[PDB]
Design a protein around this ligand. Structure first.
Ligand SMILES: OC[C@H]1O[C@@H](S[C@H]2[C@H](O)[C@@H](O)[C@H](O)O[C@@H]2CO)[C@H](O)[C@@H](O)[C@@H]1O
Ligand SMILES: CC(=O)N[C@@H]1[C@@H](O)[C@H](O)[C@@H](CO)O[C@H]1O
Ligand SMILES: *[C@@H]1O[C@H](CO)[C@@H](O)[C@H](O)[C@H]1NC(C)=O
Ligand SMILES: *[C@@H]1O[C@H](CO)[C@@H](O)[C@H](O)[C@H]1NC(C)=O
Length: 602
């Protein structure tokens, strides 16, 4: 009664081949199918031999669910998968892209653009490590990260998900990979997948390739660039990812010179698989195959053909699984897609699952639940937040006393602005909901809360969200901290051609700073029109989207640590200059890439 694929002491490739040779076509196509938890049930999983589940943004068992609730849900689905004839465990994926960010009480780290500002790849490794633990806390084994897009135009709604417009910084930050997955062995062959075991997660280098190079930063659009520029800007960090054993790669919705990435055999099979020697699995984006056609979904039969022939291995359906499986079965049955292509896809998927230990530990560890939101991880997020901050101005004239660092002891201070006491705004997109949200959406510390935690007990702190000029002038304030910026956004909703922050933002800054010396904290996912904010402000800090730990902001305001962040993108003078990147011929920045003022700790 011995079955070699079930023997944990056997080599991964032997186990993969042993299982593959036993599988029916239905079982094989099943492995290639990923479905939303929203459409999953025990019978669906079992009857269609489903390979994977995901949560999209905001796809949660309920609002406020505990780590245990998540474990029980994942285990519930796994039990059904394990009960099939062959007992192949599913892999469960989620967007844990700045912590385990769909989950209430999870540590929320700074978004990627802020992390680029740190120039600290080891910090990003440690964030990978902590994120893996908080993902495993919820029973999930797979994170759709890192986004290694090189955003070349801040008008893109996902520019905050890119570490930098400079591929060299993005390359350096692929250290997230061995954080999430564990360090690869001494001997390791570049392109093989790796996950250390049950305390780590499979990672996903996304979105292949040129997602950050689209025309006018239009999300999912066309990236017009010759092969030399594709390979010089958008590709390099994928080779770093191969070298670190990234387990999966997700394909972009975007096109390269008119060709849909989800139909690009030359790049997916010819380049990623056959040239970079990637041996993990390739996954679609969410209805990415549907969007090959215009309109999307208008020829699903072609979507399946073109994508699977291009070399994709697993399809993030995520809803219409019966139609996907029916169509792909018909294609194989009619010889339109050869069995060799199906077998390659399934070999890859199994290779990842076996390598990562999923056949040995298919179920959640309840002892891991307490990892969620752990104070050690929050302390790391607080460090990352502080290191991400870029000091742009610290005095209106070169002769003024520097405003920062501010004194913790003062009779009375003002904290103001739409973003001073709003946890959701300081986290941005991909936090609790897909688009992010407003207000107190999870566990954390706002800027107001952090100021109150920081200051001397004799310092009276007044909050006013949008005070008028008289209020400020009459208040007897020593100084003000005023926080304003962008609202949360994700993907296409963030595409923005004007890059001006919503009012009241500027008007509040002008009222506050007109009455008392002020430090302006600008929360944004990218550079935004800033000359008016600068003109009003004594000091101005680009804080990006710093996450749940607002104390990282006050650690630098009040001088516990000096400012060290440096712009990881160009700051433009006007959006009519765009695209404008470091190294261009017409480079006329307000602040060049690398710019950042410093302070010393007090
Ligand atoms: O979340 C999986 C995958 O999503 C796409 S965008 C995705 C949202 O989570 C989904 O819930 C919503 O209804 O559709 C959108 C796309 O329209 C994303 O590109 C990728 O990074 C992410 O891993
Ligand atoms: C309080 C303060 O600004 N200190 C200094 C600055 O004047 C100097 O350029 C540098 C030298 O170490 O360190 C910082
Ligand atoms: C780019 O966006 C335009 C709308 O501006 C749309 O008509 C076109 O289909 C898009 N192109 C691609 C390749 O996605
Ligand atoms: C700028 O564009 C955004 C997002 O596309 C829009 O919501 C906002 O109203 C615009 N701002 C201005 C000044 O037109």
């Amino acid at each position: 009664d011995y079955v070699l694929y079930k023997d944990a002491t056997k080599p991964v490739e032997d186990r993969v081949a042993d299982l593959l040779g036993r599988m029916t076509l239905a079982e094989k196509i099943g492995q290639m199918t990923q479905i939303e938890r929203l459409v999953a049930t025990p019978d669906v999983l079992r009857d269609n031999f489903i390979g994977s589940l995901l949560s999209g943004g905001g796809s949660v068992p309920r609002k406020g669910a505990t780590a245990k609730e998540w474990q029980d849900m994942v285990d519930g689905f796994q039990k059904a998968c394990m009960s099939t004839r062959l007992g192949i465990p599913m892999i469960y994926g989620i967007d844990a892209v700045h912590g385990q960010n769909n989950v209430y009480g999870a540590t929320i780290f700074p978004h990627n653009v802020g992390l680029g500002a740190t120039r600290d790849p080891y910090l990003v490794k440690r964030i990978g490590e902590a994120t893996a633990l908080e993902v495993r806390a919820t029973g999930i084994q797979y994170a759709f990260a890192p986004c290694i897009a090189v955003c070349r135009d801040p008008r893109w709604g996902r520019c905050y998900e890119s570490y930098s417009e400079d591929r060299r910084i993005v390359q350096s930050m692929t250290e997230l990979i061995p954080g999430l997955q564990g360090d690869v062995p001494k001997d390791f062959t570049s392109g093989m997948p790796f996950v250390a075991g049950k305390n780590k997660v499979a990672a996903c280098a996304k979105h292949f390739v040129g997602d950050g190079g689209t025309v006018d930063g239009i999300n999912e659009n066309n990236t017009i660039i010759n092969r030399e520029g594709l390979m010089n800007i958008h590709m390099p960090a994928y080779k770093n990812a191969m070298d670190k054993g990234v387990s999966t790669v997700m394909i972009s919705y975007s096109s390269w010179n008119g060709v849909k990435m989800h139909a690009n055999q030359d790049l997916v099979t010819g380049y990623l698989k056959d040239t970079l020697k990637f041996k993990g699995f390739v996954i679609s984006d969410w209805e990415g195959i549907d969007r090959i056609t215009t309109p999307a979904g208008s020829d699903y039969s072609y979507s399946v053909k073109a994508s699977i022939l291009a070399g994709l291995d697993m399809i993030m359906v995520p809803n219409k699984y019966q139609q996907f499986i029916s169509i792909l079965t018909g294609h194989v049955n009619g010889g339109v897609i050869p069995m060799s292509r199906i077998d390659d896809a399934v070999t890859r998927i199994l290779r990842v699952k076996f390598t990562m230990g999923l056949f040995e530990n298919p179920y959640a560890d309840p002892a891991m639940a307490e990892q969620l939101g752990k104070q050690e991880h929050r302390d790391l997020a607080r460090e990352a937040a502080r290191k991400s901050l870029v000091l742009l101005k610290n005095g209106k004239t070169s002769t003024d006393a520097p405003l920062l660092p501010l004194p913790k002891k003062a009779p009375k201070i003002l904290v103001a602005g739409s973003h001073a006491d709003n946890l959701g705004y300081q986290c941005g997109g991909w936090t609790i909901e897909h688009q992010g949200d407003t207000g107190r959406t999870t566990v954390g510390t706002t800027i107001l809360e952090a100021v109150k935690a920081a200051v001397d007990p004799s310092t009276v702190v007044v909050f006013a969200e949008n005070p008028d000029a008289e209020f400020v002038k009459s208040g007897g304030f020593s100084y003000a901290i005023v926080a304003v910026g962008e609202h949360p956004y994700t993907e296409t909703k963030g595409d923005n051609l004007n890059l001006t922050i919503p009012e009241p933002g500027l008007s509040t800054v002008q009222a506050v700073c007109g009455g008392v010396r002020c430090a302006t904290v600008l929360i944004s996912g990218r550079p935004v029109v800033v000359q008016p904010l600068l003109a009003a402000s004594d000091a101005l800090v680009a804080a990006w989207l710093p996450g749940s730990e607002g104390q990282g902001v006050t650690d630098a305001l009040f001088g516990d640590f000096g400012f060290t962040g440096r712009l990881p993108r160009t700051w433009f003078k006007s959006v009519d200059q765009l695209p404008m990147n470091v190294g261009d011929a017409h480079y006329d920045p307000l602040f060049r890439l690398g710019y950042g003022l410093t302070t010393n700790a007090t």
